[PDB]
Design an enzyme around this catalytic site. Sequence first.
Site, PDB file in Angstrom:
ATOM      1  N   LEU A 142      68.816 -69.855  23.550  1.00 39.83           N
ATOM      2  CA  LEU A 142      67.763 -69.187  24.297  1.00 39.83           C
ATOM      3  C   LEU A 142      66.442 -69.903  24.046  1.00 39.83           C
ATOM      4  O   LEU A 142      66.209 -70.434  22.954  1.00 39.83           O
ATOM      5  CB  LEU A 142      67.652 -67.706  23.906  1.00 39.83           C
ATOM      6  CG  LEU A 142      68.648 -66.753  24.564  1.00 39.83           C
ATOM      7  CD1 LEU A 142      68.596 -65.391  23.899  1.00 39.83           C
ATOM      8  CD2 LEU A 142      68.342 -66.631  26.045  1.00 39.83           C
ATOM      9  N   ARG A 189      63.338 -69.141  23.297  1.00 40.95           N
ATOM     10  CA  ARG A 189      62.387 -68.208  22.718  1.00 40.95           C
ATOM     11  C   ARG A 189      62.248 -68.499  21.238  1.00 40.95           C
ATOM     12  O   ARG A 189      63.072 -69.193  20.654  1.00 40.95           O
ATOM     13  CB  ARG A 189      62.828 -66.772  22.949  1.00 40.95           C
ATOM     14  CG  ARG A 189      62.277 -66.204  24.213  1.00 40.95           C
ATOM     15  CD  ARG A 189      62.758 -64.805  24.444  1.00 40.95           C
ATOM     16  NE  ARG A 189      63.206 -64.666  25.821  1.00 40.95           N
ATOM     17  CZ  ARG A 189      62.385 -64.471  26.846  1.00 40.95           C
ATOM     18  NH1 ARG A 189      61.078 -64.385  26.641  1.00 40.95           N
ATOM     19  NH2 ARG A 189      62.876 -64.360  28.077  1.00 40.95           N
ATOM     20  N   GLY A 190      61.198 -67.949  20.636  1.00 38.90           N
ATOM     21  CA  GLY A 190      60.878 -68.113  19.227  1.00 38.90           C
ATOM     22  C   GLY A 190      60.841 -69.572  18.822  1.00 38.90           C
ATOM     23  O   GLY A 190      60.510 -70.462  19.612  1.00 38.90           O
ATOM     24  N   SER A 196      62.438 -73.075  18.170  1.00 44.85           N
ATOM     25  CA  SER A 196      63.512 -73.749  18.893  1.00 44.85           C
ATOM     26  C   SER A 196      64.770 -73.813  18.038  1.00 44.85           C
ATOM     27  O   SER A 196      64.742 -74.315  16.909  1.00 44.85           O
ATOM     28  CB  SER A 196      63.069 -75.152  19.300  1.00 44.85           C
ATOM     29  OG  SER A 196      62.729 -75.936  18.168  1.00 44.85           O
ATOM     30  N   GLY A 197      65.871 -73.294  18.574  1.00 48.38           N
ATOM     31  CA  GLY A 197      67.126 -73.282  17.852  1.00 48.38           C
ATOM     32  C   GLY A 197      67.316 -72.129  16.893  1.00 48.38           C
ATOM     33  O   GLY A 197      68.122 -72.244  15.966  1.00 48.38           O
ATOM     34  N   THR A 198      66.600 -71.016  17.081  1.00 50.10           N
ATOM     35  CA  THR A 198      66.766 -69.847  16.228  1.00 50.10           C
ATOM     36  C   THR A 198      67.245 -68.596  16.957  1.00 50.10           C
ATOM     37  O   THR A 198      67.589 -67.613  16.290  1.00 50.10           O
ATOM     38  CB  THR A 198      65.453 -69.520  15.496  1.00 50.10           C
ATOM     39  OG1 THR A 198      64.410 -69.293  16.449  1.00 50.10           O
ATOM     40  CG2 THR A 198      65.057 -70.662  14.575  1.00 50.10           C
ATOM     41  N   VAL A 199      67.286 -68.598  18.289  1.00 48.00           N
ATOM     42  CA  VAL A 199      67.693 -67.433  19.070  1.00 48.00           C
ATOM     43  C   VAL A 199      68.774 -67.858  20.057  1.00 48.00           C
ATOM     44  O   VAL A 199      68.638 -68.884  20.733  1.00 48.00           O
ATOM     45  CB  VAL A 199      66.502 -66.798  19.817  1.00 48.00           C
ATOM     46  CG1 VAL A 199      66.960 -65.598  20.638  1.00 48.00           C
ATOM     47  CG2 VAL A 199      65.414 -66.390  18.836  1.00 48.00           C
ATOM     48  N   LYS A 213      69.979 -63.879  16.327  1.00 45.96           N
ATOM     49  CA  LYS A 213      68.881 -64.578  15.674  1.00 45.96           C
ATOM     50  C   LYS A 213      69.403 -65.218  14.397  1.00 45.96           C
ATOM     51  O   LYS A 213      70.096 -64.564  13.610  1.00 45.96           O
ATOM     52  CB  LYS A 213      67.729 -63.620  15.367  1.00 45.96           C
ATOM     53  CG  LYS A 213      66.509 -64.275  14.757  1.00 45.96           C
ATOM     54  CD  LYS A 213      65.422 -63.243  14.495  1.00 45.96           C
ATOM     55  CE  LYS A 213      64.230 -63.850  13.769  1.00 45.96           C
ATOM     56  NZ  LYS A 213      63.133 -62.862  13.563  1.00 45.96           N
ATOM     57  N   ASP A 218      52.006 -58.936  13.255  1.00 44.86           N
ATOM     58  CA  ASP A 218      52.267 -60.050  14.161  1.00 44.86           C
ATOM     59  C   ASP A 218      52.369 -59.583  15.608  1.00 44.86           C
ATOM     60  O   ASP A 218      53.127 -60.164  16.392  1.00 44.86           O
ATOM     61  CB  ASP A 218      53.555 -60.787  13.780  1.00 44.86           C
ATOM     62  CG  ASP A 218      53.503 -62.262  14.126  1.00 44.86           C
ATOM     63  OD1 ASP A 218      54.211 -63.054  13.467  1.00 44.86           O
ATOM     64  OD2 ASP A 218      52.734 -62.634  15.040  1.00 44.86           O
TER      65      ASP A 218
HETATM   66  C1  LIG Z   1      65.750 -62.534  27.386  1.00 39.26           C
HETATM   67  N1  LIG Z   1      65.955 -61.684  26.226  1.00 39.26           N
HETATM   68  C2  LIG Z   1      65.963 -62.292  24.909  1.00 39.26           C
HETATM   69  O1  LIG Z   1      65.802 -63.460  24.804  1.00 39.26           O
HETATM   70  C3  LIG Z   1      66.173 -61.459  23.647  1.00 39.26           C
HETATM   71  C4  LIG Z   1      66.191 -62.113  22.430  1.00 39.26           C
HETATM   72  C5  LIG Z   1      66.364 -61.413  21.250  1.00 39.26           C
HETATM   73  O2  LIG Z   1      66.391 -62.127  20.044  1.00 39.26           O
HETATM   74  C6  LIG Z   1      65.911 -61.494  18.891  1.00 39.26           C
HETATM   75  C7  LIG Z   1      64.557 -61.236  18.717  1.00 39.26           C
HETATM   76  C8  LIG Z   1      64.108 -60.638  17.548  1.00 39.26           C
HETATM   77  C9  LIG Z   1      65.020 -60.313  16.553  1.00 39.26           C
HETATM   78  N2  LIG Z   1      64.645 -59.689  15.300  1.00 39.26           N
HETATM   79  C10 LIG Z   1      63.573 -58.733  15.126  1.00 39.26           C
HETATM   80  O3  LIG Z   1      62.893 -58.387  16.033  1.00 39.26           O
HETATM   81  N3  LIG Z   1      63.400 -58.248  13.766  1.00 39.26           N
HETATM   82  C11 LIG Z   1      62.421 -57.276  13.310  1.00 39.26           C
HETATM   83  C12 LIG Z   1      62.278 -57.093  11.945  1.00 39.26           C
HETATM   84  C13 LIG Z   1      61.371 -56.170  11.462  1.00 39.26           C
HETATM   85  C14 LIG Z   1      60.617 -55.418  12.345  1.00 39.26           C
HETATM   86  S1  LIG Z   1      59.429 -54.210  11.689  1.00 39.26           S
HETATM   87  C15 LIG Z   1      57.766 -54.773  12.155  1.00 39.26           C
HETATM   88  C16 LIG Z   1      57.634 -56.263  11.837  1.00 39.26           C
HETATM   89  O4  LIG Z   1      57.827 -56.679  10.665  1.00 39.26           O
HETATM   90  O5  LIG Z   1      57.332 -57.080  12.748  1.00 39.26           O
HETATM   91  C17 LIG Z   1      60.761 -55.589  13.711  1.00 39.26           C
HETATM   92  F1  LIG Z   1      60.016 -54.849  14.586  1.00 39.26           F
HETATM   93  C18 LIG Z   1      61.671 -56.515  14.192  1.00 39.26           C
HETATM   94  C19 LIG Z   1      66.362 -60.582  16.721  1.00 39.26           C
HETATM   95  F2  LIG Z   1      67.233 -60.251  15.721  1.00 39.26           F
HETATM   96  C20 LIG Z   1      66.811 -61.181  17.887  1.00 39.26           C
HETATM   97  C21 LIG Z   1      66.539 -60.042  21.354  1.00 39.26           C
HETATM   98  C22 LIG Z   1      66.513 -59.443  22.606  1.00 39.26           C
HETATM   99  N4  LIG Z   1      66.334 -60.149  23.710  1.00 39.26           N
END
Ligand SMILES: CNC(=O)c1cc(Oc2ccc(NC(=O)Nc3ccc(SCC(=O)O)c(F)c3)c(F)c2)ccn1
Length: 288
Positions: free
Chosen positions: A20, A22-23, A25-28, A43, A142
């Site tokens: 994907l 996003r984030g 590169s190479g982590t999602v 992730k 963040d």
């Molecule tokens: C087109 N659709 C997509 O591409 C897509 C990609 C996707 O990938 C991920 C994105 C993020 C995460 N992880 C994550 O969010 N973790 C986390 C941890 C602590 C807190 S608590 C407050 C704080 O600390 O920020 C929090 F809110 C969040 C993940 F595992 C997968 C998920 C859904 N859709």
Amino acid sequence: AICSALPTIPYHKLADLRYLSRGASGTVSSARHADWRVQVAVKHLHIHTPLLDSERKDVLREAEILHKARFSYILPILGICNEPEFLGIVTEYMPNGSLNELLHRKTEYPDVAWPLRFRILHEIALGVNYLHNMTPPLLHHDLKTQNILLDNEFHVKIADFGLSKWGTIIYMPPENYASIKHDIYSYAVITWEVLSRKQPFEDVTNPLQIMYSVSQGHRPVINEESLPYDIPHRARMISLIESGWAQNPDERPSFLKCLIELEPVLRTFEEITFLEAVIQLKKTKLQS
Ligand SMILES: CNC(=O)c1cc(Oc2ccc(NC(=O)Nc3ccc(SCC(=O)O)c(F)c3)c(F)c2)ccn1
């Protein structure tokens, strides 16, 4: 007390694995669960072998926190993959990407109706307010448009693409160049960004000029060109933004106080207008 364990998902149950964009590169990645028959997101760290044991505990820590914080407006985690081959966090898949794309890709989304925008701001406050009401309180630190995800009907899911926690300075309060007044500052800038569809500090190229200006009290510009007069509840929303990004952190309201004032604003929108707003963007996206 009542405890429940997070599921452990085998790696070979994730079909159609694809990168994907996003984030980092190479982590999602995206995939499909072969048994549950649902789309998922994964992730993970950069691909390498061997995976260090210090690296595994870093992933389990993020997973344990996301598991503890399960809520209606928080990205739902589905399980973890922990094996010698792969190591990742599996969550639900948000089909409509992030709030970053919806605001500034003005060709795919020429118009975004006001009722949807106000509901997005409402649900963002609901997710963060729930994090602050935990024991101990959870602080995001963040909050940006890239971390606000949207589901099948454009409902807000708060997420975090970063990995080190366990341009990018425009959401940071001045006192930064424990600390619970950080997230509400980021939310004030997101509110201004949503209601304007403009980039904060657009004409400022050097970030040091931004950091110095906000340290002296300068904020994104609020005039007729940035925020037109035809915005519903324009006066009340501006009061929320200005109190949200106040120089003194003690004068910034809690997310609870914002929710109490947002409730009567959202109530003035008819319920059907939300569905008609979502059906419009998906229709404009059809011809592209
Ligand atoms: C087109 N659709 C997509 O591409 C897509 C990609 C996707 O990938 C991920 C994105 C993020 C995460 N992880 C994550 O969010 N973790 C986390 C941890 C602590 C807190 S608590 C407050 C704080 O600390 O920020 C929090 F809110 C969040 C993940 F595992 C997968 C998920 C859904 N859709």
